[PDB]
Amino acid sequence: QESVKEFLAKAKEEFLKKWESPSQNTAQLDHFDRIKTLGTGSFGRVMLVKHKETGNHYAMKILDKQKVVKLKQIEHTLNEKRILQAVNFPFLVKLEFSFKDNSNLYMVMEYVPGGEMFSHLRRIGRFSEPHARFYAAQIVLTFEYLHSLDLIYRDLKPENLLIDQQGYIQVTDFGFAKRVKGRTWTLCGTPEYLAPEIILSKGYNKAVDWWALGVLIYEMAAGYPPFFADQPIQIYEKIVSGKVRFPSHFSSDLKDLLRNLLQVDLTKRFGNLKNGVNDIKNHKWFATTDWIAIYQRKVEAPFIPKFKGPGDTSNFDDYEEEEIRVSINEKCGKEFTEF
Template identity: 65%
Template sequence: MCSVRGAQVFFLYILVLYSYKPNRHKISTGPLLYSIMKRVNSPESPRSPPPAHSTVSTHSYQSAASTPTESSSNRSYLRLNKSTGQSPSPSPSSQSVQRSTSRSPATPTSSDTVKRSFFRFNSTPLSGGSNSTYSNSFFNPNLTMGQTGSNVKRSQSDIQTFLDKEKEKFIEKIENPIKQNGRLEDFDLIRTIGTGSFGRVLLVTHRNSTHEKIALKILDKQVVVKMKQVDHTLAEKKILQALSCPFIVKLLYTFKDSSYLYLGLEYAPGGEMFTHLRAFGRYTEDMTRFYAAQIVLAFEYLHHLGVIYRDLKPENLLFASDGYLKMTDFGFAKRVKDRTWTLCGTPEYLAPEIILSRGYNKGVDYWALGVLMYEMSAGYPPFFADQPIQIYEKIVSGRVRFPNHFTVDLKDLLKNLLQVDLTRRYGNLKPGVRDIKEHRWFRDMDFIAIYEKSIPAPFIPRTDRENYEIYEEQPLTVSSTERYPREFADF
C-alpha cells in the first residue's frame, strides 16, 4: 500500500513539474501514467466564481480585492509552451482592451505578460454604448438565431454524403501533400503579430499582384527539435494543408530554409476571441450559440476525417472580417483511428480521461467545447484554481457550478458535454454530434445557414485598427549550413 501511495505522489509531482507555470498555458509531454489521490473525491465544493466586478491575479482566480491588469495573449497562430515567469504590475481597469506600444518578445514588459487566465472586467455583457470600443454599429445585441429567411432542413443522409466526399478529398491531399510553394523573398514583412517558444508570426504581404495579407508562422528548427516537437510540427503542416472548412484557417504557403520552417496562413484581421471576450466581460447566450455552432460544425468535419483537435480555447479562435470564427493552431491535431494517450493541451480544458491517462479520442474535443461554451457565457472557465494540480482534481471530480443567469437549456447541454463518464458524454455516443445539434438549446439554430454564413454575425470586429499586440522586431538569422535535414525532410 505504501509503495502504491508513493507512486501516486511521485507521478503527481512529475505532472505538476511538467505543467506548472504562473499563467494558463499549454502542456505537452509524452504519455504519463498516474492516478489522482483520494482528495479528488473529497466533499469540498468547487470554488465559487469571482463576484461581480471582481478581479484575479496572474495565478488564475484568486483574491477579489486585486486590480485588473493589462494583458493579452498571442498564442493563436504560434504555440507558447513556456510562460514568461513575470508577474504583471497592476493598472486601472478599462472596458476596452489596453495594449502596449512596444514590447520585446524575448523580454516582455511586466504590464503585458502573456497570460492564459481570464480577467473578468465586468459582470454583465457589454451592450455597445456610445463611448464603448464596441459601438452599436458593430455589435447587434438583439440578434435572434434562425433569422435567415431560408431555414432549409437537410437530411442526415445529405450531410453524410457531403462529409464522405470531403473525406475523400482529405485523404487524397494527405497522401499527396503540397510541396514547398514559396520563399521568404516572395513576401514583404510588415510586423510581428505573435511570438512564442518556437519562433514568431509575422504579418506579411505577398509580392504578387494581389498583395494579399498572410500570417507567416516561422518556427526555429533548433528549438522545435530541442522541445521534442518535431512530430507535432510535421503533423500540423500535413493536416492543415489537407483541410478545407470555412471555420478553419487555410494553409496557403509552406516552405523552409536552413534554419526555419514557414507556414503561410490565412490572415484573420479581427484578432483573438480571447481579447474580445475580455472586453465584453461575457457573451450573451445568443452570441455563445452563434460561435458554438461554428465549432460544432468544425468538429463534425474534423472528426469525420479522423482528426482530433485537442487545443480548443479562446486564444485559438480568430475573428475574420465578417465576424465568423477561424480555428487556428493545429500543433496538437492528430489523426486517430482508435485512441491516443499523449498528455497535451491547456490545463483548464483537459478532459478527465487525458488527466487519468486512460486513452482518449474525439470525446476530448466535446469536453473542451463544453468548457468553451461555459467560458463564453460566464466570462471564466468552469474549472479554475491557483495550482494546476487543483484544476486537475476539480476536472476529474466532474462537479460544475453554474451562474444564475445560465438558462435551463444551456445548463442541460453543458451537463451532457462536461460529463466525466464517456458513455454519457454528448458527441461521443452512437448518434454522434447529432445529440448536440438536435439539443433544445440549438432549437432555432440553422446549421446550414451558419455553414453558408448567411446569418449576420452578432459582432463585427473593427479592422481599421490593429487587433494584435505590438512587438519589438527581431531579425531572422538564417544559417549558412542546413540544420536537421533528416528531421524535417518531410516538411
C-alpha cells in the same frame, strides 16, 4: 440525411487525396516583406507579411527547427503542416504556402484582421447566450467535419478562434492536431481545457474535443472557465471531480447541455454516444439554430470587428521585434525531410 452523409463522404475523399500526396516548397522567404510580430511562443512566432509582387497580406508562422527538436515537437509539427495542407472548411484558417530553409519551417496562412475571440470576450466581460450559441454552432460543424476525417483537434481555447470581416470564426493553430483511428496518448493542451482522461494518462479519443467545447461554451457565457484555480494542480483536481457550479443567469437549457458535455465518464459524454454529433445538434439549447444557414454564412453575425483594412494590426498586441535569421549551414535536415 443522405445529403449530409454524401457531403461528408466527398469531404473525406478530397482530404485523403491531399493527405497521401502533400504539397511542398510552394514559396520562399524573400518573396515577402516582414511587417509586424502578431504573437510569440516557445519554438515559434506568427508575423504579418506582405507578398512583394501581388501585395496580398498573410500570417506567416515561423518555427525554429533546433527548438522544435529540443521541445520534442517533431511529430506534432509534421502533423500540423500535413493536415493543414489537406483540409478545407468554411471555419478553418486556410494554408496558402509552405516551405523550409536551413534554419526554420514556414506556414503561410490567410490573415484574419479581426483578432482573437479571447480579446473580444475579455473586453466585454461575457457573451449573451445568442452570441455564444452563434460561435458554438460553428465549432460543432467544424468538429463534425474534422472527426469524420479521423482528425482530433486537441487545442480548443478562445485564443485559437479568430474573428473575420463578416464576424464568423476561423480556427487557427493545428500544432496538436493528429490523425487517429482509435486511441492516442500524448499529454498536450492548456490546463483549463483538458478532459479528465488526459489528466489521468489514459488512452483517449475524439471525446476530448467535445469536453473542451463544454469548457468553451461555459467560458463564453460566464466570462471565466468552469474549473478555474490559481495553479494547474488545483485546476486538475477540480476537473477530475467534475463538480461544476453554474451562474444563476444561465438558462436551464444551457445548464443541461453543459452537464452532458462536461461528463467525466467519457462513455456517457454527448458527442460520444450512439447518435454522435446529433445529440448536440438536436439539444433544446440549439433549437433556434439553422445549421445550413450557419454553414452557408447567411446568418447576420452578432458582432463585426472594427479594423481599417486587410493590413490593419490594431486588434493584435505588441511584442519585441526579433530577427529572422537563416544559417549558412543546414540544421536538422533528416528530422524534417517530409516537410
